[PDB]
What does this fold into?
Amino acid sequence: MQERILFGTYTKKTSQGIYQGTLDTTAKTLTNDGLLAATQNPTYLALSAKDCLYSVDKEDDEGGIAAWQIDGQTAHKLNTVVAPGTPPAYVAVDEARQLVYSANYHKGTAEVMKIAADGALTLTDTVQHSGHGPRPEQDGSHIHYTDLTPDNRLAVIDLGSDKVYVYNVSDAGQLSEQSVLTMEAGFGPRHLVFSPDGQYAFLAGELSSQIASLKYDTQTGAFTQLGIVKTIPADYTAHNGAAAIRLSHDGHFLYVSNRGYNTLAVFAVTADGHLTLIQQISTEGDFPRDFDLDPTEAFVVVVNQNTDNATLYARDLTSGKLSLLQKDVTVPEGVCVRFLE
It folds into this structure.
């Protein structure tokens, strides 16, 4: 069958915006069919059930989120919500509340926007954080993730201050703190993903190349750190920044991308959130900032930021391991993989 994929990118060299491709499950191929939307620095993407696309957006010295309505193999711009400063780094959709969340790295903010009847957005709240860390990259607050918890609270990750916040969300679109988990100094938390039963969360530590297993309690809206594992060899001393983290639908396998060592590390999830490294596979390019399993979960697509190429893997449904199928599919400055679902 044919599965549509959207690619987010940086537009500092040759990219013209958001691209789209197709994953052919039978032929075992991956293509970049072309540009879907001409826009600047759409480094992260989010989709709604009404097929509206929300992307990181840069409009000169202003940055924010752009809203588009997808119609077939085309995209129609609805509107944008921008403000003086840098563009955000993450964006997500809250279907039930009809809100869009975004995280801004440089500003250290978490923002909330409400979705109008036609998909257009309106800013409702901007939460400012503060703090810092021991590492050079932690000069100030750097929010890198804003997404829903199993009980619909909002998990907000601050890479700059080594903290994972949990916020309650109002219907009107405002956040109010519930809890804050502080990680060991220098951990540099970036993204996380919850288990299918909502009892556990796996947090990627970008700066320390580690993954923390966490127990989540819906009653307290808080976390408890369970254990930590490395995402690269113990002797690899060169630069490495973990990036994206994904979990299979059955919750049995965890995946994380490594920028520097340039691989996808596969972990088997066992009792009480424990992780076991079972595979390290090259992404066939430099700096794999994002990747994801396809809807059937029989494949994985990763994009490499610095080499402008995407790679397709076959994924064993029972073992969770990956094997190369195709490499060097051109996607300029690719940094986000968004399958239609």
The chain has one domain: 2-341.
